[PDB]
């Protein structure tokens, strides 16, 4: 939701074209009283309570809550036997058929989320293998998220990714209350 | 719009077995968009319901209503197509099993009134439908006799049960 920006919008009776003059006088015509031909009652009139402008749904859970959610997702995968640790993502070949057959043989789910430490160092073989696959998605460690972890049946992590995630998530525990955004220099925060 | 009446002539029945009564022929005909009120056409339709083709034509030939001529033309066309295409042996051996008028597609016009006011005239159009069935016209339903009335009353009396009890 936080990224959502609904662009739905409707014209209110003020914004609908025309509709300035009173259609007919208050009394004498025997018809209902009206002030413009663009009120919500009329065909082609405005919308009384329609969507208004591009609306943001932005909101931020506490970063501790988000880190706890990541931890809970990891624990859920481990406890449900969907988490697999790898020494490295290097593949014998960049053929996607090899990766799919390996997953099927090892009884991985229909969807696999592979994670590597950094984008730049990811092996060319695995990069080529996953570029041509839809249910096998390869992401950097920084891109790990609860939504993708839940969407993908199995989660594959490398050992450096495991260490990186442990460090980053455990840091949220035992950290001071911020004095200013952590992007700024701190005594001990890289 | 619906045009099922025309399609009704295209249904082909399977051949009849020798030990089966001869199926009477049925011919569905209609005229669409007649400049005439369906309410006025209904009277002519009702008049000719159940009559032989010749009797209906005779009755229509001497009726002053405009719809009478249209219905006569439709009936003549129905007779012609019944003989030519529906394998009806005798022209006169046909009776009007069904005859009805339906609303057509009408047009809206303005009728000017006295004080800058107006009404909405409707240029009324009507459809006319006929089914011609081969064979002599079915005999009219005889009026209920006193014997039949008494029989029905006695049947109702005998049908009585002891209500709301064991």
């Amino acid at each position: 939701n936080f990224k959502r920006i609904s662009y739905a919008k409707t014209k209110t009776r003020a914004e609908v074209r025309g509709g300035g003059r009173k259609p007919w006088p208050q009394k004498g015509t025997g018809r209902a009283r009206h002030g413009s031909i663009r009120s919500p009652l009329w065909r082609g009139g405005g919308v009384a309570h329609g969507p208004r402008g591009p609306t943001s749904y932005y909101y931020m859970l506490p970063m501790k809550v988000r880190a706890l959610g990541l931890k809970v997702a990891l624990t859920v995968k481990l406890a449900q036997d969907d988490l697999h640790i790898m020494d490295s993502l290097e593949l014998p070949t960049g053929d996607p058929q090899y990766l799919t057959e390996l997953a099927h043989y090892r009884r991985w789910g229909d969807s696999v989320l592979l994670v590597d430490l950094t984008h730049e160092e990811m092996p060319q073989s695995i990069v080529e293998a996953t570029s041509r696959l839809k249910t096998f998605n390869l992401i950097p460690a920084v891109g790990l998220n609860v939504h993708s972890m839940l969407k993908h049946q199995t989660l594959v992590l490398t050992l450096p990714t495991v260490a990186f995630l442990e460090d980053k998530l455990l840091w949220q525990d035992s950290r001071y209350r911020p004095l200013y955004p952590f992007s700024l220099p701190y005594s001990d925060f890289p | 719009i619906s045009r099922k009446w025309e399609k009704k002539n295209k249904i082909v029945y399977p051949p009849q077995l020798p030990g089966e009564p001869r199926r009477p022929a049925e011919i569905y005909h209609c005229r669409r968009q007649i400049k005439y009120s369906k309410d006025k056409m209904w009277y002519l339709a009702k008049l000719i319901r159940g009559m032989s083709i010749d009797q209906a034509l005779a009755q229509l030939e001497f009726n002053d209503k405009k719809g009478a001529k249209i219905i006569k033309e439709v009936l003549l066309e129905a007779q012609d197509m019944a003989v030519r295409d529906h394998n009806v042996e005798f022209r006169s051996n046909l009776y009007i099993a069904e005859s009805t008028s339906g609303r057509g597609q009408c047009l809206k016009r303005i009728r000017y009134h006295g004080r800058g006011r107006f009404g909405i005239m409707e240029k009324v159009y009507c459809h006319y439908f006929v089914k011609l069935v081969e064979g002599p016209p079915p005999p009219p339903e005889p009026p209920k006799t006193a014997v039949a009335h008494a029989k029905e009353y006695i049947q109702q009396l005998r049908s009585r049960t002891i209500v709301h009890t064991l």
Partner: peptide, 16 residues
């Protein structure tokens, strides 16, 4: 006095 209101003329001019 209230003047009469004419409806749009197109509504009563349509043809098949």
């Amino acid at each position: 006095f209230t003047p009469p209101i004419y409806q749009p003329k197109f509504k009563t001019e349509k043809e098949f």
